[PDB]
Amino acid sequence: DIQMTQSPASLSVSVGETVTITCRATKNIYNNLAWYQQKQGRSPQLLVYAATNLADGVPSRFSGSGSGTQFSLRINSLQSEDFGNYYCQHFWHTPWTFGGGTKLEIKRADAAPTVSIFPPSSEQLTSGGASVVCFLNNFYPKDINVKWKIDGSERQNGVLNSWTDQDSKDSTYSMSSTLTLTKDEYERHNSYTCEATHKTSTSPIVKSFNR
Amino acid sequence: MSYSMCTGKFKVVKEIAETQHGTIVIRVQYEGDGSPCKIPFEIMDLEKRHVLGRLITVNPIVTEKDSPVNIEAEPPFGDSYIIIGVEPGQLKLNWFK
Amino acid sequence: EVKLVESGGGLVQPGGSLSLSCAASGFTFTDYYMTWVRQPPGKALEWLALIRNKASGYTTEYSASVKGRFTISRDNSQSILYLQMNALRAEDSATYYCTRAKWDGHYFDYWGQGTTLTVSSAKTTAPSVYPLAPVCSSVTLGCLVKGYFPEPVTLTWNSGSLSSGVHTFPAVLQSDLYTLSSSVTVTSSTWPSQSITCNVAHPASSTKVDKKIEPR
């Protein structure tokens, strides 16, 4: 069998810049290679076939290159609609294996997060559980660190984080951080803090509440 | 317009025709996937290490799997191998000129 | 013109069977090779099976991952593609796409919208929905959807009339069930003066929940 490797795994590129992503086959496949694009929550779409042919409706800013084992996908003056996942696939003998993918993200100016803290709902407390929620919205770059503090001391267990994909309107990221405790533990303490460390500031953004 | 390389098996439709100008015409049928695709073709020594012959047909391509393709080639004098397609099931035809 | 619509996706117990179908239109079905490709959550695409056109005698090929368990077939009178799946396992959980190949099997030029399969022993469960009101310029409200199975849930704010300012976070597996949250950011003059409701629908358990966010 032939394995397909893509590079880089991820990259952030600005609107208007030119980007080149690569695909490597473990064995010679001549030009039996396809490139696909897959946007957030949608079906993959054919971009390039036979290494260099543009598929129907694909903008001419896209170009595929290569023959043998080394292939490239170039996007000239890239647009907001070009951001998403990119896969290569060989068409030699079956199995027709896909590469692991390259995630193309939008590079934009820095944006500090909008931090909001929420105490558990009293409705939840009846179940014996207590989820403290912290939303860190509309930030850039994607890298961020959240620290939970209960009565001044850091808490690490019971933390569940979820990240949105890059926003379609402003190219920012958002993050939800949930601290789940038992009702008895939640009622044993008073101060609840969610601390956000991001590139935009040396000092962390602190959102807190007292029971 | 780029075409894929044919990955599958080929079959000789009829007996290889000899022309009066020292060339041969081979009529092949494609059995594989990926048409329209380029026909892998090479005329080599019996040891399969050096290219000896000359292909006359410009870019042999399978337009449709259902339609056979005429391949004109110029073999060297003596013994040579006509190699059609890629492995597995690659056609390896002995030829004596 | 060319359209592919998959159906049949759902919840199956491990070792179970399920059949997916793909309704094709806008082309001469018998002239084209057809394929099934899957994509597990957050993972790469995986080619599974192919079925050749009329000229190639409608022969089949399978990936080693599904050989002996899955069967690809086609109804040439109705232009429907099928995927018969037996001995299902947890790793078969994915979005399944049916595809058309451009050049006799090569290059997947048309893809359907996909159908989701979940292979699990977990039972269908409706979520609990919790309102997230601020601790009591702009105000952020929330909605916590906890303890549902299987995916998905649909979450809207004020029946879809609020969309700008909304962030719906991917579901996370917590205590053998799914948990998701959503935030809505609105101007401080909007809430509490105007009503803001979280609308949650869980089709698998035929549940609809409306949670009005009240101040604390």
PDB file of N, CA and C in Angstrom, chain A residues 31-34 36 38 42-46 49-50 53 87 89 91-92 94-96 98-100 116-121 123-124 127 131 133 135 137-138 160-164 167 169 174-176 180 209, chain C residues 35 37 39 43-47 50 61 97 102-103 105-109 111-114 129-135 140-142 144 146 164 167-174 181-183 185 211 216:
ATOM      1  N   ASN A  31       1.003  11.223 -11.853  1.00  0.00           N
ATOM      2  CA  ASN A  31       0.150  12.365 -11.519  1.00  0.00           C
ATOM      3  C   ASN A  31      -1.255  11.951 -11.047  1.00  0.00           C
ATOM      4  N   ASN A  32      -1.431  10.692 -10.595  1.00  0.00           N
ATOM      5  CA  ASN A  32      -2.727  10.158 -10.125  1.00  0.00           C
ATOM      6  C   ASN A  32      -2.983  10.678  -8.716  1.00  0.00           C
ATOM      7  N   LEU A  33      -3.304  11.970  -8.620  1.00  0.00           N
ATOM      8  CA  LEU A  33      -3.448  12.662  -7.346  1.00  0.00           C
ATOM      9  C   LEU A  33      -4.564  13.682  -7.393  1.00  0.00           C
ATOM     10  N   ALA A  34      -5.351  13.734  -6.311  1.00  0.00           N
ATOM     11  CA  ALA A  34      -6.423  14.696  -6.182  1.00  0.00           C
ATOM     12  C   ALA A  34      -6.245  15.522  -4.917  1.00  0.00           C
ATOM     13  N   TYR A  36      -8.659  17.941  -2.256  1.00  0.00           N
ATOM     14  CA  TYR A  36     -10.021  18.227  -1.824  1.00  0.00           C
ATOM     15  C   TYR A  36     -10.020  19.314  -0.778  1.00  0.00           C
ATOM     16  N   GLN A  38     -12.404  20.869   2.436  1.00  0.00           N
ATOM     17  CA  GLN A  38     -13.513  20.606   3.333  1.00  0.00           C
ATOM     18  C   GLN A  38     -13.653  21.735   4.333  1.00  0.00           C
ATOM     19  N   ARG A  42     -19.211  20.708   6.515  1.00  0.00           N
ATOM     20  CA  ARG A  42     -19.659  20.454   5.142  1.00  0.00           C
ATOM     21  C   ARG A  42     -18.930  19.275   4.481  1.00  0.00           C
ATOM     22  N   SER A  43     -19.448  18.840   3.335  1.00  0.00           N
ATOM     23  CA  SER A  43     -18.887  17.749   2.558  1.00  0.00           C
ATOM     24  C   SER A  43     -17.590  18.183   1.893  1.00  0.00           C
ATOM     25  N   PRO A  44     -16.616  17.252   1.716  1.00  0.00           N
ATOM     26  CA  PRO A  44     -15.419  17.595   0.946  1.00  0.00           C
ATOM     27  C   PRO A  44     -15.818  17.941  -0.494  1.00  0.00           C
ATOM     28  N   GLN A  45     -15.001  18.752  -1.161  1.00  0.00           N
ATOM     29  CA  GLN A  45     -15.221  19.134  -2.555  1.00  0.00           C
ATOM     30  C   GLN A  45     -13.910  18.960  -3.310  1.00  0.00           C
ATOM     31  N   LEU A  46     -13.989  18.449  -4.540  1.00  0.00           N
ATOM     32  CA  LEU A  46     -12.845  18.245  -5.418  1.00  0.00           C
ATOM     33  C   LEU A  46     -12.297  19.607  -5.878  1.00  0.00           C
ATOM     34  N   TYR A  49      -7.532  17.547  -9.849  1.00  0.00           N
ATOM     35  CA  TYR A  49      -7.471  16.143 -10.219  1.00  0.00           C
ATOM     36  C   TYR A  49      -6.364  15.947 -11.251  1.00  0.00           C
ATOM     37  N   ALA A  50      -5.750  14.738 -11.291  1.00  0.00           N
ATOM     38  CA  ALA A  50      -4.622  14.407 -12.171  1.00  0.00           C
ATOM     39  C   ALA A  50      -3.463  15.382 -11.904  1.00  0.00           C
ATOM     40  N   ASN A  53      -5.180  19.544 -12.961  1.00  0.00           N
ATOM     41  CA  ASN A  53      -6.462  20.019 -13.519  1.00  0.00           C
ATOM     42  C   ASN A  53      -7.366  20.619 -12.462  1.00  0.00           C
ATOM     43  N   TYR A  87      -7.204  18.026   1.822  1.00  0.00           N
ATOM     44  CA  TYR A  87      -6.765  16.636   1.763  1.00  0.00           C
ATOM     45  C   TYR A  87      -6.254  16.291   0.382  1.00  0.00           C
ATOM     46  N   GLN A  89      -5.257  12.800  -2.108  1.00  0.00           N
ATOM     47  CA  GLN A  89      -5.628  11.387  -2.239  1.00  0.00           C
ATOM     48  C   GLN A  89      -4.979  10.815  -3.481  1.00  0.00           C
ATOM     49  N   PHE A  91      -4.599   7.959  -6.595  1.00  0.00           N
ATOM     50  CA  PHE A  91      -5.419   7.103  -7.445  1.00  0.00           C
ATOM     51  C   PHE A  91      -4.572   6.090  -8.201  1.00  0.00           C
ATOM     52  N   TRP A  92      -3.687   5.431  -7.456  1.00  0.00           N
ATOM     53  CA  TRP A  92      -2.873   4.350  -7.983  1.00  0.00           C
ATOM     54  C   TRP A  92      -3.703   3.062  -7.762  1.00  0.00           C
ATOM     55  N   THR A  94      -5.871   0.411  -5.466  1.00  0.00           N
ATOM     56  CA  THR A  94      -6.659   0.460  -4.227  1.00  0.00           C
ATOM     57  C   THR A  94      -5.834  -0.173  -3.078  1.00  0.00           C
ATOM     58  N   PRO A  95      -5.911   0.321  -1.816  1.00  0.00           N
ATOM     59  CA  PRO A  95      -6.770   1.414  -1.317  1.00  0.00           C
ATOM     60  C   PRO A  95      -6.301   2.801  -1.754  1.00  0.00           C
ATOM     61  N   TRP A  96      -7.256   3.662  -2.101  1.00  0.00           N
ATOM     62  CA  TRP A  96      -6.981   5.031  -2.518  1.00  0.00           C
ATOM     63  C   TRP A  96      -6.937   5.891  -1.271  1.00  0.00           C
ATOM     64  N   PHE A  98      -6.008   8.702   1.606  1.00  0.00           N
ATOM     65  CA  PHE A  98      -6.001  10.142   1.776  1.00  0.00           C
ATOM     66  C   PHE A  98      -4.843  10.519   2.695  1.00  0.00           C
ATOM     67  N   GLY A  99      -4.368  11.753   2.567  1.00  0.00           N
ATOM     68  CA  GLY A  99      -3.386  12.305   3.488  1.00  0.00           C
ATOM     69  C   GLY A  99      -4.106  12.631   4.785  1.00  0.00           C
ATOM     70  N   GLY A 100      -3.353  12.938   5.838  1.00  0.00           N
ATOM     71  CA  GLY A 100      -3.935  13.284   7.136  1.00  0.00           C
ATOM     72  C   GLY A 100      -4.619  14.639   7.188  1.00  0.00           C
ATOM     73  N   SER A 116     -16.533  35.884  30.421  1.00  0.00           N
ATOM     74  CA  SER A 116     -17.794  35.875  31.184  1.00  0.00           C
ATOM     75  C   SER A 116     -17.864  34.624  32.056  1.00  0.00           C
ATOM     76  N   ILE A 117     -18.127  34.800  33.358  1.00  0.00           N
ATOM     77  CA  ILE A 117     -18.233  33.710  34.333  1.00  0.00           C
ATOM     78  C   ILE A 117     -19.699  33.498  34.772  1.00  0.00           C
ATOM     79  N   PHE A 118     -20.101  32.232  34.898  1.00  0.00           N
ATOM     80  CA  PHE A 118     -21.459  31.888  35.272  1.00  0.00           C
ATOM     81  C   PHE A 118     -21.508  30.878  36.402  1.00  0.00           C
ATOM     82  N   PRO A 119     -22.190  31.225  37.511  1.00  0.00           N
ATOM     83  CA  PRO A 119     -22.363  30.250  38.601  1.00  0.00           C
ATOM     84  C   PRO A 119     -23.283  29.110  38.147  1.00  0.00           C
ATOM     85  N   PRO A 120     -23.240  27.903  38.764  1.00  0.00           N
ATOM     86  CA  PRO A 120     -24.208  26.871  38.366  1.00  0.00           C
ATOM     87  C   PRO A 120     -25.646  27.353  38.557  1.00  0.00           C
ATOM     88  N   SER A 121     -26.526  26.847  37.704  1.00  0.00           N
ATOM     89  CA  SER A 121     -27.943  27.111  37.784  1.00  0.00           C
ATOM     90  C   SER A 121     -28.451  26.362  39.029  1.00  0.00           C
ATOM     91  N   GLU A 123     -31.164  24.903  39.294  1.00  0.00           N
ATOM     92  CA  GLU A 123     -31.841  23.732  38.710  1.00  0.00           C
ATOM     93  C   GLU A 123     -30.880  22.556  38.628  1.00  0.00           C
ATOM     94  N   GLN A 124     -29.624  22.829  38.245  1.00  0.00           N
ATOM     95  CA  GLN A 124     -28.586  21.810  38.173  1.00  0.00           C
ATOM     96  C   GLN A 124     -28.248  21.255  39.556  1.00  0.00           C
ATOM     97  N   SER A 127     -29.684  18.014  40.973  1.00  0.00           N
ATOM     98  CA  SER A 127     -29.118  16.762  40.441  1.00  0.00           C
ATOM     99  C   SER A 127     -27.873  16.265  41.222  1.00  0.00           C
ATOM    100  N   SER A 131     -21.915  22.857  37.693  1.00  0.00           N
ATOM    101  CA  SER A 131     -21.017  23.257  36.613  1.00  0.00           C
ATOM    102  C   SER A 131     -20.836  24.765  36.632  1.00  0.00           C
ATOM    103  N   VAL A 133     -19.352  27.778  34.567  1.00  0.00           N
ATOM    104  CA  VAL A 133     -18.993  28.006  33.159  1.00  0.00           C
ATOM    105  C   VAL A 133     -18.274  29.334  32.954  1.00  0.00           C
ATOM    106  N   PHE A 135     -16.888  31.613  29.636  1.00  0.00           N
ATOM    107  CA  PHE A 135     -16.795  31.831  28.198  1.00  0.00           C
ATOM    108  C   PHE A 135     -15.707  32.859  27.943  1.00  0.00           C
ATOM    109  N   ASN A 137     -14.598  34.684  24.769  1.00  0.00           N
ATOM    110  CA  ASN A 137     -15.065  34.935  23.414  1.00  0.00           C
ATOM    111  C   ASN A 137     -14.282  35.918  22.565  1.00  0.00           C
ATOM    112  N   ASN A 138     -14.299  35.670  21.248  1.00  0.00           N
ATOM    113  CA  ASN A 138     -13.748  36.510  20.192  1.00  0.00           C
ATOM    114  C   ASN A 138     -12.285  36.939  20.355  1.00  0.00           C
ATOM    115  N   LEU A 160     -13.509  20.791  31.891  1.00  0.00           N
ATOM    116  CA  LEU A 160     -13.795  20.396  30.517  1.00  0.00           C
ATOM    117  C   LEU A 160     -13.848  21.625  29.634  1.00  0.00           C
ATOM    118  N   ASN A 161     -13.006  21.624  28.601  1.00  0.00           N
ATOM    119  CA  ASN A 161     -12.864  22.717  27.655  1.00  0.00           C
ATOM    120  C   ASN A 161     -13.367  22.346  26.279  1.00  0.00           C
ATOM    121  N   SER A 162     -13.932  23.330  25.580  1.00  0.00           N
ATOM    122  CA  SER A 162     -14.420  23.187  24.212  1.00  0.00           C
ATOM    123  C   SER A 162     -14.058  24.456  23.445  1.00  0.00           C
ATOM    124  N   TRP A 163     -13.546  24.304  22.221  1.00  0.00           N
ATOM    125  CA  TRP A 163     -13.139  25.421  21.364  1.00  0.00           C
ATOM    126  C   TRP A 163     -13.965  25.453  20.088  1.00  0.00           C
ATOM    127  N   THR A 164     -14.437  26.643  19.688  1.00  0.00           N
ATOM    128  CA  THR A 164     -15.156  26.762  18.420  1.00  0.00           C
ATOM    129  C   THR A 164     -14.115  26.768  17.297  1.00  0.00           C
ATOM    130  N   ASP A 167     -14.226  31.769  13.620  1.00  0.00           N
ATOM    131  CA  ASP A 167     -15.462  32.490  13.293  1.00  0.00           C
ATOM    132  C   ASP A 167     -15.502  32.953  11.840  1.00  0.00           C
ATOM    133  N   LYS A 169     -17.336  35.361  10.445  1.00  0.00           N
ATOM    134  CA  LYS A 169     -17.472  36.814  10.299  1.00  0.00           C
ATOM    135  C   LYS A 169     -16.195  37.589  10.656  1.00  0.00           C
ATOM    136  N   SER A 174     -13.286  31.327  20.047  1.00  0.00           N
ATOM    137  CA  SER A 174     -13.984  31.401  21.308  1.00  0.00           C
ATOM    138  C   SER A 174     -13.749  30.071  22.018  1.00  0.00           C
ATOM    139  N   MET A 175     -13.845  30.089  23.339  1.00  0.00           N
ATOM    140  CA  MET A 175     -13.585  28.918  24.159  1.00  0.00           C
ATOM    141  C   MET A 175     -14.543  28.880  25.329  1.00  0.00           C
ATOM    142  N   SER A 176     -15.033  27.678  25.646  1.00  0.00           N
ATOM    143  CA  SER A 176     -15.900  27.470  26.789  1.00  0.00           C
ATOM    144  C   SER A 176     -15.127  26.567  27.727  1.00  0.00           C
ATOM    145  N   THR A 180     -16.674  21.278  36.703  1.00  0.00           N
ATOM    146  CA  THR A 180     -17.761  20.485  37.296  1.00  0.00           C
ATOM    147  C   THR A 180     -17.329  19.916  38.638  1.00  0.00           C
ATOM    148  N   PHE A 209     -16.647  35.542  40.975  1.00  0.00           N
ATOM    149  CA  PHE A 209     -17.914  35.687  41.684  1.00  0.00           C
ATOM    150  C   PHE A 209     -17.835  35.034  43.047  1.00  0.00           C
TER     151      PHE A 209
ATOM    152  N   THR C  35     -18.775   5.374  -4.996  1.00  0.00           N
ATOM    153  CA  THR C  35     -17.925   5.090  -3.852  1.00  0.00           C
ATOM    154  C   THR C  35     -18.596   5.458  -2.522  1.00  0.00           C
ATOM    155  N   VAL C  37     -17.128   6.831   1.275  1.00  0.00           N
ATOM    156  CA  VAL C  37     -15.997   7.400   2.010  1.00  0.00           C
ATOM    157  C   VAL C  37     -16.568   7.788   3.370  1.00  0.00           C
ATOM    158  N   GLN C  39     -15.752   9.617   7.471  1.00  0.00           N
ATOM    159  CA  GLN C  39     -14.909  10.522   8.233  1.00  0.00           C
ATOM    160  C   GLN C  39     -15.302  10.496   9.708  1.00  0.00           C
ATOM    161  N   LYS C  43     -11.259  13.485  12.457  1.00  0.00           N
ATOM    162  CA  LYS C  43     -10.247  12.634  11.819  1.00  0.00           C
ATOM    163  C   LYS C  43     -10.245  12.778  10.284  1.00  0.00           C
ATOM    164  N   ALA C  44      -9.303  12.108   9.614  1.00  0.00           N
ATOM    165  CA  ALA C  44      -9.188  12.182   8.155  1.00  0.00           C
ATOM    166  C   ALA C  44     -10.255  11.364   7.441  1.00  0.00           C
ATOM    167  N   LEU C  45     -10.421  11.646   6.149  1.00  0.00           N
ATOM    168  CA  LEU C  45     -11.311  10.922   5.265  1.00  0.00           C
ATOM    169  C   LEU C  45     -10.715   9.535   5.009  1.00  0.00           C
ATOM    170  N   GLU C  46     -11.581   8.536   4.880  1.00  0.00           N
ATOM    171  CA  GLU C  46     -11.163   7.164   4.624  1.00  0.00           C
ATOM    172  C   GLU C  46     -12.012   6.548   3.527  1.00  0.00           C
ATOM    173  N   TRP C  47     -11.371   6.145   2.416  1.00  0.00           N
ATOM    174  CA  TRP C  47     -12.067   5.454   1.339  1.00  0.00           C
ATOM    175  C   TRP C  47     -12.404   4.035   1.841  1.00  0.00           C
ATOM    176  N   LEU C  50     -15.838   0.748  -3.421  1.00  0.00           N
ATOM    177  CA  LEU C  50     -16.145   1.240  -4.752  1.00  0.00           C
ATOM    178  C   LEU C  50     -16.985   0.221  -5.494  1.00  0.00           C
ATOM    179  N   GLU C  61     -14.578  -3.267  -4.862  1.00  0.00           N
ATOM    180  CA  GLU C  61     -13.308  -3.243  -4.128  1.00  0.00           C
ATOM    181  C   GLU C  61     -13.615  -2.675  -2.762  1.00  0.00           C
ATOM    182  N   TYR C  97     -20.126   9.359   3.494  1.00  0.00           N
ATOM    183  CA  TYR C  97     -20.424  10.047   2.240  1.00  0.00           C
ATOM    184  C   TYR C  97     -20.455   9.070   1.100  1.00  0.00           C
ATOM    185  N   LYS C 102     -15.069  10.785 -11.236  1.00  0.00           N
ATOM    186  CA  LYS C 102     -15.027  11.493 -12.516  1.00  0.00           C
ATOM    187  C   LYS C 102     -14.569  10.634 -13.694  1.00  0.00           C
ATOM    188  N   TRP C 103     -13.384  10.013 -13.572  1.00  0.00           N
ATOM    189  CA  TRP C 103     -12.742   9.252 -14.636  1.00  0.00           C
ATOM    190  C   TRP C 103     -12.582   7.787 -14.295  1.00  0.00           C
ATOM    191  N   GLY C 105     -13.610   5.681 -11.909  1.00  0.00           N
ATOM    192  CA  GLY C 105     -13.131   5.401 -10.558  1.00  0.00           C
ATOM    193  C   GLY C 105     -12.230   6.457  -9.962  1.00  0.00           C
ATOM    194  N   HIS C 106     -11.540   7.228 -10.817  1.00  0.00           N
ATOM    195  CA  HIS C 106     -10.616   8.247 -10.337  1.00  0.00           C
ATOM    196  C   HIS C 106     -11.270   9.606 -10.149  1.00  0.00           C
ATOM    197  N   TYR C 107     -10.926  10.251  -9.026  1.00  0.00           N
ATOM    198  CA  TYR C 107     -11.270  11.626  -8.640  1.00  0.00           C
ATOM    199  C   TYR C 107     -12.718  11.809  -8.252  1.00  0.00           C
ATOM    200  N   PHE C 108     -12.966  11.977  -6.943  1.00  0.00           N
ATOM    201  CA  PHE C 108     -14.325  12.082  -6.410  1.00  0.00           C
ATOM    202  C   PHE C 108     -14.899  13.478  -6.618  1.00  0.00           C
ATOM    203  N   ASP C 109     -15.559  13.685  -7.779  1.00  0.00           N
ATOM    204  CA  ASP C 109     -16.075  14.987  -8.241  1.00  0.00           C
ATOM    205  C   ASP C 109     -17.363  15.494  -7.595  1.00  0.00           C
ATOM    206  N   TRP C 111     -20.003  14.725  -4.093  1.00  0.00           N
ATOM    207  CA  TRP C 111     -20.168  14.114  -2.782  1.00  0.00           C
ATOM    208  C   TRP C 111     -21.544  14.467  -2.274  1.00  0.00           C
ATOM    209  N   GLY C 112     -22.135  13.565  -1.500  1.00  0.00           N
ATOM    210  CA  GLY C 112     -23.426  13.846  -0.881  1.00  0.00           C
ATOM    211  C   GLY C 112     -23.212  14.672   0.367  1.00  0.00           C
ATOM    212  N   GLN C 113     -24.287  15.017   1.071  1.00  0.00           N
ATOM    213  CA  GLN C 113     -24.184  15.823   2.296  1.00  0.00           C
ATOM    214  C   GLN C 113     -23.671  15.021   3.520  1.00  0.00           C
ATOM    215  N   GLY C 114     -23.708  13.694   3.396  1.00  0.00           N
ATOM    216  CA  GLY C 114     -23.287  12.775   4.439  1.00  0.00           C
ATOM    217  C   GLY C 114     -24.410  12.312   5.340  1.00  0.00           C
ATOM    218  N   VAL C 129     -31.386  21.005  30.301  1.00  0.00           N
ATOM    219  CA  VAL C 129     -31.031  22.317  29.759  1.00  0.00           C
ATOM    220  C   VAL C 129     -30.995  23.300  30.914  1.00  0.00           C
ATOM    221  N   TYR C 130     -29.845  23.953  31.108  1.00  0.00           N
ATOM    222  CA  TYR C 130     -29.649  24.913  32.193  1.00  0.00           C
ATOM    223  C   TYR C 130     -29.400  26.350  31.707  1.00  0.00           C
ATOM    224  N   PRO C 131     -30.156  27.344  32.239  1.00  0.00           N
ATOM    225  CA  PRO C 131     -29.928  28.744  31.825  1.00  0.00           C
ATOM    226  C   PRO C 131     -28.698  29.331  32.502  1.00  0.00           C
ATOM    227  N   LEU C 132     -27.866  30.074  31.747  1.00  0.00           N
ATOM    228  CA  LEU C 132     -26.676  30.725  32.305  1.00  0.00           C
ATOM    229  C   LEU C 132     -26.854  32.234  32.262  1.00  0.00           C
ATOM    230  N   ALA C 133     -27.350  32.800  33.372  1.00  0.00           N
ATOM    231  CA  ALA C 133     -27.606  34.238  33.523  1.00  0.00           C
ATOM    232  C   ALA C 133     -26.365  34.868  34.164  1.00  0.00           C
ATOM    233  N   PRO C 134     -26.072  36.110  33.884  1.00  0.00           N
ATOM    234  CA  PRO C 134     -24.906  36.754  34.450  1.00  0.00           C
ATOM    235  C   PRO C 134     -24.973  36.878  35.943  1.00  0.00           C
ATOM    236  N   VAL C 135     -23.826  36.988  36.572  1.00  0.00           N
ATOM    237  CA  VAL C 135     -23.779  37.069  38.008  1.00  0.00           C
ATOM    238  C   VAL C 135     -24.530  38.322  38.476  1.00  0.00           C
ATOM    239  N   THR C 140     -23.478  38.936  28.040  1.00  0.00           N
ATOM    240  CA  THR C 140     -23.376  37.579  27.533  1.00  0.00           C
ATOM    241  C   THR C 140     -24.229  36.670  28.395  1.00  0.00           C
ATOM    242  N   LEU C 141     -25.071  35.867  27.730  1.00  0.00           N
ATOM    243  CA  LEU C 141     -25.948  34.870  28.343  1.00  0.00           C
ATOM    244  C   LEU C 141     -25.500  33.528  27.828  1.00  0.00           C
ATOM    245  N   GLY C 142     -25.922  32.475  28.500  1.00  0.00           N
ATOM    246  CA  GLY C 142     -25.536  31.136  28.111  1.00  0.00           C
ATOM    247  C   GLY C 142     -26.617  30.094  28.268  1.00  0.00           C
ATOM    248  N   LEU C 144     -26.547  25.713  28.885  1.00  0.00           N
ATOM    249  CA  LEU C 144     -25.785  24.479  29.074  1.00  0.00           C
ATOM    250  C   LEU C 144     -26.699  23.297  28.832  1.00  0.00           C
ATOM    251  N   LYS C 146     -26.746  19.429  28.931  1.00  0.00           N
ATOM    252  CA  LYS C 146     -26.006  18.343  29.539  1.00  0.00           C
ATOM    253  C   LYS C 146     -26.732  17.011  29.564  1.00  0.00           C
ATOM    254  N   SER C 164     -26.101  36.660  15.160  1.00  0.00           N
ATOM    255  CA  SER C 164     -24.908  37.484  15.311  1.00  0.00           C
ATOM    256  C   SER C 164     -24.754  37.481  16.833  1.00  0.00           C
ATOM    257  N   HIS C 167     -22.202  31.852  19.890  1.00  0.00           N
ATOM    258  CA  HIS C 167     -21.126  30.867  19.774  1.00  0.00           C
ATOM    259  C   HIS C 167     -21.667  29.573  20.364  1.00  0.00           C
ATOM    260  N   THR C 168     -21.804  28.545  19.538  1.00  0.00           N
ATOM    261  CA  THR C 168     -22.263  27.221  19.964  1.00  0.00           C
ATOM    262  C   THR C 168     -21.040  26.335  19.912  1.00  0.00           C
ATOM    263  N   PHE C 169     -20.649  25.811  21.062  1.00  0.00           N
ATOM    264  CA  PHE C 169     -19.440  25.013  21.218  1.00  0.00           C
ATOM    265  C   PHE C 169     -19.617  23.545  20.892  1.00  0.00           C
ATOM    266  N   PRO C 170     -18.582  22.905  20.280  1.00  0.00           N
ATOM    267  CA  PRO C 170     -18.689  21.472  19.979  1.00  0.00           C
ATOM    268  C   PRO C 170     -18.979  20.678  21.251  1.00  0.00           C
ATOM    269  N   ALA C 171     -19.803  19.627  21.114  1.00  0.00           N
ATOM    270  CA  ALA C 171     -20.159  18.739  22.209  1.00  0.00           C
ATOM    271  C   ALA C 171     -18.920  17.985  22.686  1.00  0.00           C
ATOM    272  N   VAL C 172     -18.866  17.737  23.984  1.00  0.00           N
ATOM    273  CA  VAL C 172     -17.807  16.977  24.623  1.00  0.00           C
ATOM    274  C   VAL C 172     -18.444  15.770  25.311  1.00  0.00           C
ATOM    275  N   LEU C 173     -17.747  14.625  25.325  1.00  0.00           N
ATOM    276  CA  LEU C 173     -18.208  13.413  25.989  1.00  0.00           C
ATOM    277  C   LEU C 173     -17.880  13.548  27.483  1.00  0.00           C
ATOM    278  N   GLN C 174     -18.927  13.539  28.320  1.00  0.00           N
ATOM    279  CA  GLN C 174     -18.835  13.707  29.769  1.00  0.00           C
ATOM    280  C   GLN C 174     -19.807  12.741  30.417  1.00  0.00           C
ATOM    281  N   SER C 181     -22.403  23.694  25.229  1.00  0.00           N
ATOM    282  CA  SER C 181     -22.828  25.005  25.703  1.00  0.00           C
ATOM    283  C   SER C 181     -22.923  25.971  24.534  1.00  0.00           C
ATOM    284  N   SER C 182     -23.653  27.056  24.731  1.00  0.00           N
ATOM    285  CA  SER C 182     -23.784  28.117  23.749  1.00  0.00           C
ATOM    286  C   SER C 182     -23.860  29.441  24.467  1.00  0.00           C
ATOM    287  N   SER C 183     -23.243  30.466  23.889  1.00  0.00           N
ATOM    288  CA  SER C 183     -23.312  31.808  24.442  1.00  0.00           C
ATOM    289  C   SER C 183     -23.951  32.724  23.416  1.00  0.00           C
ATOM    290  N   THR C 185     -24.137  36.966  22.852  1.00  0.00           N
ATOM    291  CA  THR C 185     -23.695  38.289  23.300  1.00  0.00           C
ATOM    292  C   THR C 185     -24.602  39.323  22.656  1.00  0.00           C
ATOM    293  N   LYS C 211     -35.836  27.461  27.151  1.00  0.00           N
ATOM    294  CA  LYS C 211     -35.385  27.958  28.435  1.00  0.00           C
ATOM    295  C   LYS C 211     -35.199  29.458  28.353  1.00  0.00           C
ATOM    296  N   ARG C 216     -30.676  36.764  37.730  1.00  0.00           N
ATOM    297  CA  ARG C 216     -30.444  36.244  39.032  1.00  0.00           C
ATOM    298  C   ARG C 216     -30.763  37.317  40.039  1.00  0.00           C
TER     299      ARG C 216
END
